[PDB]
Nucleic acid binder design. Structure first.
Ligand SMILES: Nc1nc2c(ncn2[C@@H]2O[C@H](COP(=O)(O)OP(=O)(O)OP(=O)(O)O)[C@@H](O)[C@H]2O)c(=O)[nH]1
Ligand SMILES: Nc1ncnc2c1ncn2[C@@H]1O[C@H](COP(=O)(O)OP(=O)(O)OP(=O)(O)O)C[C@H]1O
Ligand code: SF4
Ligand SMILES: [Zn+2]
Ligand SMILES: [Zn+2]
Ligand SMILES: [Zn+2]
Lengths: 495, 86, 512, 158, 39, 97
RNA sequence: UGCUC
DNA sequence: TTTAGTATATGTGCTGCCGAATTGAGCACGGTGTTTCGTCCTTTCCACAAG
DNA sequence: CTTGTGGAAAGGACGAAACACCGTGCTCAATTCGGCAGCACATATACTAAA
């Protein structure tokens, strides 16, 4: 007849497992594909385009236009992500250092880690110990990277592995064909002589034949990471369940919901205020479209690589808008807010919205002396007392007091402002309707937002806090004036 | 400038090149038949260990009639270490 | 190696089961680990872990090694799990080169992994007694003859033999016997005088105990390489050169190992006297063939000496490189057309070349050659040199040269083949699962006939089988059958390309 | 000829059909020559020498055909044969010859012969997975899955 | 830690949240079990 | 909001949080920074650890392992932004007992 | 930016 | 064969070009918002020739 | 003094391109301070050569 399913469980988060998502997981998580670079339609309504940026299927940012995925308003909409496909892969600025580290760890020919069987067994035994901490993991990573950089030849395939370093910005160079002062090897000689046709057709290749090392573009790096044996992934100190080496090179971009990208419709002019992330995503889509157009029309390789580097730089700015190796000709004109900038800083999420955040049911007022009050008592004005309300639950003890408070109404100081019934959570304003009928129908368990009366514990603080005594819980006493008064003997703690 | 696209590209874009047909001959067909025979015969082999069924509802007189019987190979414990003896 | 792990998981699930394929994938992903930690990480009972390890080491898929404190660590061989897919090709080649007796011998060796000569010959006799009828019995004499003939040809090899416990450290038994390999008795068959006759499945102390045999996959790989080189040289020049190189490789098989840049040089006189008499060929004709093969721009053979008349040597690494280049150009042609293949061969012959030079040497109009070049770049078929004028590496002041790296391209193509076979196996399993209801229906309606075939077999049960609703579903059954057949054929044929790429990647490494 | 004109360019328009016809005719001629050399079976060296075709010979042959009105020089046919070589269908060899009916290169002569490919099409191309353009986005559980693949569906239906 | 407890919106382990409180309800641990007649 | 002209509320800065920690009032700090400021109820999937909506996980296309959870809205915004940065926080829920 | 403390 | 010289080989040790931090808040306000450079379409108004 | 058929111009959308007309072009560093990566470069160890 009816199936047993639990309504709600008191679930408590145990721990947060950080990791990475592969392009397939990004596609699976996303709901729609954003391919249109424009924001609104051509009509005068300026409605958001479909399958484009600012689409309402990825959440909502306006109180009037609800979400298309879930039929809820802005207050109840959590938001949905989208996935944008890139024509050419790009290095992840966040994991770029990790990419370089991995490339230095593994071979560039067979994709195996530069470690002997004995060293592999030693590291596996040292890592299998329980209670491995973050510091120990980083130390083991450092040691393994050092011991891998010590070697220069591969024990699995025998291919030579030179130094891998960073050149320019978001470009990696592997010195495979390094200059050998002693007797040169056959491989480097073959590589140098293979430029016969290039020198014949372009003499400028011969003087610049040197310094011609391997350039590990995102394509080759991704192809190498896709063929890394899973046995060596643990040796890279990267959790296999968290992510894979192929996930460091991003091929899809996760456009966030509209809850993170608030849009203000400024009807006073022919424009709207949008965040920087929207413009960055629009520019990325435009660059992808331009790259596709040049590929179809058969453009030159120089401008193709220029567009690829520009796309990489724009993606890096979208991730971290404050870099140092940005060329001057490629330097941004204005300043944009990236995710890194929104996270770090004094106004960031950690310091501005998690560690310290603004709250309601609070006030700020000037102070004045009043020695006629106890040290544990503080004076509150009637005006502020009528605004800061306290939710008292109707019980068998204070039933008549709450009845009288409701009968008084929001006008008289001793009273309440709103009533929340026990059965239904629909609040009722006491300024309208017959307050006597509401007082006569006060059931046990209801919530009454009573005014701040005498005896209520209230926190009193001075914004500049040096020690814990700068904020103390006192007993509130209502007074007809408009200032917070307290015993002057308590001035020394607050300073 | 590149034109704007209203709908996303198809999930499976069409290609004008088709896969080359498979090689034909008695050898390929014989290899296919032998691979099918191996698939059919290697599942019933004792080496193919199946998931041990559990949570029997009840015991019945027909148990002895429906009891699955199959010969079990005896591993050579001389070559195998001692940690794998039952 | 995620695609490799997926393929190994699929093969172990389709061949052995579920509780064992998990242990196999865990061993392949984590490598060597003791038994207790494996059982802890897997999350299953200890007896199941023991059974999985035993059934895996029986097929020579995993090995056990001793370490400090006498602990035993089990390491899986992903290469062997990949070669497992080549069993049909092994059976086909051993049936082509030998009789059905050797076919059944190799089949039993591959299905059981490790067995003694007596057991395998008994099984072969029991299975062949069903092939023939009329009371004819199968004797062990011819079976042992075929077994020793396969042995002396290095097709079947004795497994590592446990050393004698009494002579080697008599006393406390170690946790592991530490099996060692001996090259003296590697291909020496035991003298078994006992004979017998196979039974016809009526259903109504060991002299060779401890001597286990297995299939030498290295010999099969060498034979496949030889056949591929022979087919290539036959398609290139003629079948006469193919026969010549086949004879040369047959002569070189014994006097060479499985990995060497060059084989032992042969002289013209020995190749002439060893060639089959079926060809009316003289000494001067053989000399002309050898000297024109030595001048081939592909370098299949080489002179490498003048003593003893015509002294020549075969280039194996160069032949494998040529075969890999052929495979790569063929896949490029079949994936992007003939013009893209032309551009690919152009940029391959010319070690370094630019867009304008490619357009000048290929005679392909603009807006099309660059498109194919960028398409190949997006698929990792080639890498750019990007010789910079200044260390800034700015695109506007640098040259971009196209260059095809055969090693990286071959590795990428091998990964693509692995993932393709994985997807084909997944599709076959999906088609089998989604239609398992009709499969069981057909099995039941056909077992209605398979039962009481002769005893109490009335004719009134033949006109009611097709009366059911299975008749219109026979079309779907045939569609599923042909789809599975084609998928299996494709999986088997991709194995040839996988073997070519694996041999090319193996013969180019030093393992220093 | 480099900055303007050319035997292939006609009114600033590349003639793809012209080069295609040239390639087809040259390949047919070389294949017929190789077939005649194989059928002669007089001697392997003589067979290879007869299957060989010099640039001047094929050039005079094309001139005798007269497919187009524009005059085709010897180097033009040489470039056509080089493009054919890049197609993996013919083979060229440089032999030493002081002077003869060609007299193009000093002491060297290029001989072209039709040669069969090294190996037939591989097994990877015979599967839809090897020729898939969205092969990168393949995944077990997702929108693009081998179970609900359209390429393999049409390939098995065919 | 405390910072993560504050971020995730859960009571920190330090302070009043180090221990747990139990209710002194009228109960009977391990109540009598009804006997099984058929088994 | 921030300003009085904008009808903004007071800010419990980092120093106020430090004072409340020094006092040890865990429930008061929770009520201030979680309940009365940015309280919200999200839906988390116990299988993949991602955030769902209306008791449904679009990632796994299931709703049996989805459970409600109280959280500050700023923390959910941080999780979403990190998921946008490819830094996926996987939440492994469990019973409060 | 100006301030308030 | 052995002591002395040459080379390599890595280690280690001193710089110099990077990236990151710099009190808590409260309160007012004035600015300005992405655009803009050139081309085309449309609409309007007025140089003369006409009543 | 009213009028009109045809003409010019001015204003407002609109699309190619990239917020600077041309291609230049500067200054200052805001103060530590803990990483680092290069180079360099040193010293000794090992191996080859002369006696
Ligand atoms: N009148 C006024 N001037 C300001 C304000 N904020 C900044 N300024 C002026 O602008 C300069 C500093 O700019 P910032 O405060 O960094 O501007 P911003 O915070 O980047 O701008 P938003 O990110 O849009 O808030 C100072 O010299 C101030 O004089 C403000 O709220 N009102
Ligand atoms: N930048 C600030 N940070 C923290 N508190 C501040 C700041 N500016 C002012 N205050 C508050 O004001 C008080 C400073 O007053 P104080 O310096 O002690 O007297 P004063 O301003 O020197 O007066 P006299 O000049 O001595 O008459 C203490 C502090 O709580
Ligand atoms: S869509 Fe199907 S046929 Fe195509 S690559 Fe993916 S699994 Fe293979
Ligand atoms: Zn929504
Ligand atoms: Zn290697
Ligand atoms: Zn889920």
């Amino acid at each position: 007849k009816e199936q047993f399913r639990e309504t709600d469980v008191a679930k408590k988060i145990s721990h947060i497992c950080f990791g990475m998502k592969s392009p397939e997981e990004m596609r699976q998580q996303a709901h729609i594909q954003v391919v249109s670079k424009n924001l609104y339609s051509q009509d005068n309504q300026h409605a958001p385009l479909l399958y484009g940026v600012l689409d309402h299927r990825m959440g909502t940012s306006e109180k009037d236009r609800p979400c298309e995925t879930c039929g809820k308003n802005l207050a109840d909409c959590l938001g949905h992500y989208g996935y944008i496909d890139l024509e050419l892969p790009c290095f992840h600025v966040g994991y770029f250092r990790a990419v370089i580290g991995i490339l230095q760890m593994i071979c560039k020919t067979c994709c195996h880690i530069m470690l002997s069987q004995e060293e592999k067994k030693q590291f596996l035994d040292y890592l299998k110990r329980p209670g491995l901490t973050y510091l120990q993991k980083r130390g083991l990573k450092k040691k393994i990277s050092d011991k891998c950089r010590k070697k220069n030849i591969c024990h699995h395939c025998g291919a030579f592995n030179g130094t891998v370093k960073k050149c320019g910005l978001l470009k990696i160079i592997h010195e495979k064909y390094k200059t050998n002062k002693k007797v040169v090897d056959p491989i480097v000689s073959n590589f140098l002589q293979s430029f016969e046709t290039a020198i014949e057709h372009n003499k400028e290749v011969e003087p610049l034949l040197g310094r011609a090392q391997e350039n590990l573009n995102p394509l080759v790096v991704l192809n190498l990471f896709k063929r890394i044996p899973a046995e060596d992934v643990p040796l890279l100190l990267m959790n296999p369940e968290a992510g894979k080496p192929s996930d460091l090179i991003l091929t899809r971009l996760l456009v966030p919901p509209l809850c993170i990208r608030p849009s203000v419709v400024s009807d006073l002019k022919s424009g709207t205020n949008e965040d920087d992330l929207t413009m960055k995503l629009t520019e990325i889509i435009f660059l992808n479209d331009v790259i596709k157009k040049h590929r179809i029309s058969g453009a030159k390789t120089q401008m193709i690589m220029e567009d690829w580097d520009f796309l990489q730089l724009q993606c890096a700015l979208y991730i971290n808008s404050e870099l140092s190796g940005i060329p001057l000709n490629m330097a941004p004109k204005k300043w944009t807010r990236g995710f890194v900038q929104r996270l770090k800083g004094k106004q960031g999420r950690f310091r501005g919205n998690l560690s310290g955040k603004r709250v309601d049911f609070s006030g700020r007022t000037v102070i004045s002396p009043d020695p006629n009050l106890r040290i544990d008592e503080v004076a509150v004005p009637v005006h502020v007392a009528k605004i800061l309300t306290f939710p008292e639950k109707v019980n068998k003890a204070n039933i008549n007091f709450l009845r009288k408070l409701v009968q008084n109404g929001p006008e008289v100081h001793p009273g309440a402002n709103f009533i929340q019934q026990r059965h239904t959570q629909m609040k009722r304003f006491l300024k309208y309707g017959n307050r006597e009928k509401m007082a006569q129908e006060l059931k046990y368990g209801d919530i009454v937002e009573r005014h701040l009366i005498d005896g209520d514990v209230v926190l009193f603080n001075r914004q500049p806090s040096l020690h814990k005594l700068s904020i103390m819980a006192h007993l509130a006493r209502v007074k007809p004036h408009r200032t917070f008064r307290f015993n002057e003997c308590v001035c020394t703690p607050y300073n | 400038l590149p034109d704007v696209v209203l709908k996303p590209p198809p999930l499976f874009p069409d290609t004008d090149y088709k896969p080359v047909p498979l090689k034909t001959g008695e050898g390929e067909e014989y290899m296919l038949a032998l691979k099918q025979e191996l698939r059919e015969t290697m599942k019933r082999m004792p080496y193919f260990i199946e998931t041990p069924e559990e949570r029997q509802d009840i015991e019945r007189y027909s148990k002895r009639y429906m009891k699955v019987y199959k010969e079990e190979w005896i591993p050579d414990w001389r070559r195998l270490p001692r940690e794998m003896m039952p | 190696t995620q695609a490799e792990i997926k393929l190994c998981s699929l093969l172990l699930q389709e061949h052995f089961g579920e509780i064992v394929e998990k242990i196999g994938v865990h061993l392949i992903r984590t490598g060597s680990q003791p038994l207790r930690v494996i059982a802890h990480d897997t999350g299953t009972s200890l007896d199941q872990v023991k059974k999985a390890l035993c059934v895996l080491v029986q097929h020579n898929l995993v090995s056990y090694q001793v370490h400090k404190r006498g602990v035993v660590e089990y390491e899986a061989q992903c290469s062997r799990v990949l070669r497992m897919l080549r069993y049909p090709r092994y059976i086909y080649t051993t049936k082509t080169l030998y009789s059905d007796t050797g076919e059944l011998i190799v089949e039993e060796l591959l299905l059981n992994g490790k067995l003694t000569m007596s057991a395998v010959v008994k099984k072969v006799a029991d299975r062949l007694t069903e092939t023939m009828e009329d009371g004819k019995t199968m004797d062990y004499a011819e079976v042992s003859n075929t077994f020793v003939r396969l042995a002396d040809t290095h097709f079947v090899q004795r497994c590592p033999s446990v050393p004698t416990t009494e002579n080697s450290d008599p006393g406390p038994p170690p946790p592991a016997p530490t099996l060692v390999i001996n090259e003296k008795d590697m291909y020496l068959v035991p003298k078994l005088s006992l004979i017998g006759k196979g039974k016809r499945r009526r259903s109504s102390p060991i002299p060779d105990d401890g001597i286990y045999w297995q299939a030498n996959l290295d010999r099969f790989h060498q034979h496949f390489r030889d056949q591929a080189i022979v087919s290539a040289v036959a398609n290139r020049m003629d079948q006469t050169s193919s026969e010549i190189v086949r004879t040369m490789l047959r002569m070189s098989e014994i006097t060479t190992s499985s990995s060497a840049p060059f084989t032992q040089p042969l002289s013209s006189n020995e190749i002439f006297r060893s060639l089959p008499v079926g060809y009316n060929i003289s000494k001067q004709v053989l000399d002309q063939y050898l000297t024109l093969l030595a001048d081939d721009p592909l370098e299949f053979v080489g002179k490498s000496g003048d003593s003893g008349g015509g002294m020549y040597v075969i280039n194996l690494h160069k032949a494998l490189a040529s075969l890999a280049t052929a495979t790569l150009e063929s896949v490029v042609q079949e994936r992007f057309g003939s013009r893209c293949a032309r551009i690919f061969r152009l940029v391959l012959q010319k070690k370094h070349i630019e867009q304008k030079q490619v357009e000048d040497f290929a005679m392909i109009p603009a807006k099309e050659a660059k498109d194919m070049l960028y398409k190949m770049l997006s698929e990792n078929f080639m890498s750019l040199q990007e010789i910079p004028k200044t260390p800034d590496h700015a695109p506007s002041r640098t040259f971009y040269l196209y260059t095809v790296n055969i090693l990286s391209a071959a590795r990428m193509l091998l990964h693509r083949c692995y993932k393709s076979i994985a997807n084909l196996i997944e599709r076959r399993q999906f088609e089998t699962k989604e239609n398992k209801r009709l499969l069981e229906k057909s099995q039941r309606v056909e077992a209605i006939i398979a039962s009481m075939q002769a005893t109490g077999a009335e004719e009134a049960q033949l006109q009611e089988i097709e009366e059911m609703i299975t008749a219109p579903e026979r079309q779907q059954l045939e569609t599923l059958k042909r789809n599975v057949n084609k998928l299996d054929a494709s999986e088997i044929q991709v194995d040839e390309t996988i073997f070519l790429l694996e041999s090319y990647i193996e013969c180019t490494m030093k393992r220093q | 000829r480099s900055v303007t004109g050319g035997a292939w360019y006609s009114d600033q328009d590349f003639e793809s059909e012209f080069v295609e016809v040239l390639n087809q005719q040259c390949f047919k001629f070389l294949q017929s020559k190789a077939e005649t050399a194989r059928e002669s079976k007089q001697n392997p060296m003589i067979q290879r020498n007869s299957s060989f075709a010099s640039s001047h010979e094929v050039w005079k042959y094309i001139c005798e055909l007269g497919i187009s009105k524009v005059e085709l020089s010897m180097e033009d046919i040489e470039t056509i044969l080089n493009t054919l070589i890049y197609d993996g269908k013919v083979e060229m060899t440089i032999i030493a010859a002081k002077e003869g009916t060609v007299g193009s290169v000093d002491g060297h002569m290029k001989l072209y012969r039709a040669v069969n490919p090294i190996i037939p099409p591989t097994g990877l191309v015979r599967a839809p997975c090897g020729l898939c353009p969205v092969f990168d986005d393949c995944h077990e559980g997702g929108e693009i899955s081998p179970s609900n693949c359209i390429y393999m569906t049409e390939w098995l239906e065919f | 830690g405390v910072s993560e407890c504050i971020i995730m919106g859960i009571p920190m382990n330090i302070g009043t949240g180090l221990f747990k409180l139990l209710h002194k309800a009228d109960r009977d641990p391990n109540p009598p079990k009804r006997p099984l007649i058929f088994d | 909001t921030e300003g009085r002209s904008r009808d903004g509320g007071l800010r419990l800065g980092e120093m106020e949080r430090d004072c409340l920690i020094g006092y040890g009032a865990s429930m008061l700090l929770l009520e201030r920074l979680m309940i009365s400021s940015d309280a919200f109820e999200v839906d988390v999937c116990g299988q993949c650890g991602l955030l769902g909506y209306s008791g449904w996980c679009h990632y796994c296309k299931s709703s049996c392992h989805v459970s409600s959870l109280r959280i500050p809205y700023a923390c959910k915004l941080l999780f979403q932004e990190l998921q946008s940065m490819n830094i996926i926080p996987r939440l492994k829920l469990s019973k409060y007992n």
